[PDB]
């Protein structure tokens, strides 16, 4: 809950709740009651919706690709990163270190494709989404033995059903996920610089278990991330400049705010 205001009356003392020295690096704690006559008000207002869990715990699309029924793009692959999407990336980046569990929901959608193919009569498409942790063998074709997933986890989902969803633990090696990294990967202060030295979550492959029809079909897998059971440390300034890369802080300089005219103009221009 939020703090209620205390009924205040006049004052004429040497107590100065309003005068301070902001150089101390300490935020003042003045409240209306200190610089005016306040009435008692009872605050039932709650800061429930601004807890870190409520802020971050909402499914956001982090990426999406396509694969097909035929041709070259018959299976897809994505090296896992939350940095390809501007929206979720920016919320996580309000904090230097974050620790959390994840809830993965996938929205797989197919579209019939233009063809000269006659007598199309598609059968129901079943998809396989497979996770290849850093080090395991990678599918080099829609049919390499790799898709057996004897040990790799993978979801088989038939179209028309509810979106495939599963949760994942805090898969880090560190006691918290690092959102920023002011360092290199090599001790010779060389090689990679930044957060990419830390990103090693593996790849995610998807494919059609069956082609289904004689005509072409293209599917689009959308990956949704939802941070459950979140812990966030060391907050920082929200991102001002637009994102340029998915692996680095690279920004193009932009001004502090938008403008108006005179410091006296009560209106944005």
């Amino acid at each position: 809950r939020v703090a209620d205001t205390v009924g205040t009356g006049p004052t004429n003392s040497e107590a100065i709740p309003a005068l301070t020295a902001a150089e101390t690096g300490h935020t003042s704690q003045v409240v209306p009651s200190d610089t005016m006559q306040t009435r008692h008000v009872k605050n039932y207002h709650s800061r429930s919706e601004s807890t870190i869990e409520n802020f971050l715990c909402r499914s956001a699309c982090v990426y999406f690709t396509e694969y097909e029924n035929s041709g070259a793009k018959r299976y897809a692959e994505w090296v896992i990163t939350p940095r390809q999407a501007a929206q979720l990336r920016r919320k996580l980046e309000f904090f230097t270190y974050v620790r959390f569990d994840l809830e993965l929901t996938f929205v797989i959608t197919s579209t019939q494709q233009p063809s000269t193919t006659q007598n199309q009569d598609a059968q129901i498409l079943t998809h396989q989404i497979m996770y290849v942790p850093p080090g395991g063998p990678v599918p080099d074709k829609v049919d390499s033995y790799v898709w057996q997933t004897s040990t790799n986890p993978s979801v088989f989902w038939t179209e028309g059903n509810a979106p495939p969803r599963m949760s994942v633990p805090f898969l880090s090696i560190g006691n918290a996920y690092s959102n920023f990294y002011d360092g290199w990967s090599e001790f010779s202060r060389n090689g990679v610089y930044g957060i990419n030295t830390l990103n090693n979550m593996g790849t995610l492959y998807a494919r059609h278990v069956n082609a289904g029809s004689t005509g072409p079909i293209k599917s689009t897998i959308r990956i949704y991330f939802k941070p459950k059971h979140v812990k966030a440390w060391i907050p920082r300034p929200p991102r001002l400049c637009q994102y340029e890369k998915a692996k680095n802080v690279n920004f193009q300089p932009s001004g502090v705010t938008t403008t108006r005219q005179s410091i006296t103009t009560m209106t944005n221009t």
Binding site: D4, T5, G7, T8, P32, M36, Q37, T38, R39, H40, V41, K42
Partner: protein, 256 residues
């Protein structure tokens, strides 16, 4: 020695007597009072003028004719120019009040007629021209009664309120206005109507220029009549008294 017909209401400097009346109809069963710390949002301390604001303000008299359709007075705007109620109302962003509305109309034993004295909370009115919204100068009348129309107002390219009495300017049935606190001034048994309105609104306090929370309407359901000789000029005088007026948010004066 008593009588249900006699009355005397004292508020501030003013006192009001009645020798023929009905009960005092108290708002929605609620008598006006001040805002509680439990229901308050504005943290600044209020000004409660008391005897200076909550007193009997008698606006202009209006003439009841054999052909008058009705009248209406918005509420914060009526007393917006009257005394210290109008002043505090200008210097303050927020305000809250209740009222004791005393409508007076005396005729004789040979006169007949019957008025509906209602207090319509949030009388949002319609425009003659369906595309527009009435103008501020068409809806409001400070201390000067705004009057209903006998017949449909023409829908040109105006911002005229659609005044036909039978729809009350709100697109409803004028005969159902009886849900809103009211009384009747049947000249046969009555002499005046008294209605004590509590503060009705969805917010604890609101601005008094931007929003008129209550609208008083005096609509004659049975017309004035009398045989020749019987005095012809029968006026109606409206006396309203703010009740438990608080004002938060002091600044310079006005509205803009």
């Amino acid at each position: 020695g008593y009588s249900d017909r006699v009355r005397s209401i004292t508020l501030g400097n003013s006192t009001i007597t009645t020798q023929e009346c009905a009960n005092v109809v108290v708002g929605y069963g609620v008598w006006p009072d001040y805002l509680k710390d439990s229901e308050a949002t504005a943290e600044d301390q209020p000004t409660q003028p008391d005897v200076a604001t909550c007193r009997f303000y008698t606006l202009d008299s209006v003439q009841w004719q054999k052909t008058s359709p009705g009248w209406w007075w918005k509420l914060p705007d009526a007393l917006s120019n009257l005394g210290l109620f109008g002043q505090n109302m200008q210097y303050h962003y927020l305000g809250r009040t209740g009222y004791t509305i005393h409508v007076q109309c005396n005729a004789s034993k040979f006169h007949q007629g019957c008025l509906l004295v209602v207090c319509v909370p949030e009388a949002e009115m319609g425009c003659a021209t369906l595309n527009n919204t009435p103008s501020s100068a068409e809806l409001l009348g400070g201390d000067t009664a705004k009057e209903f129309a006998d017949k449909p107002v023409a829908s040109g390219s105006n911002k005229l309120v659609q005044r036909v009495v039978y729809n009350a300017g709100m697109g409803v049935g004028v005969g159902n206005l009886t849900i809103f606190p009211h009384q009747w001034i049947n000249l046969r048994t009555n002499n005046s109507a008294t209605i004590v309105m509590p503060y009705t609104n969805s917010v604890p306090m609101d601005n008094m220029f931007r929003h008129n929370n209550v609208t008083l309407m005096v609509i004659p359901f049975v017309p004035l009549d009398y045989c020749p000789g019987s005095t012809t000029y029968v006026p109606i005088t409206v006396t309203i008294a703010p009740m438990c007026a608080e004002y938060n948010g002091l600044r310079l004066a006005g509205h803009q």
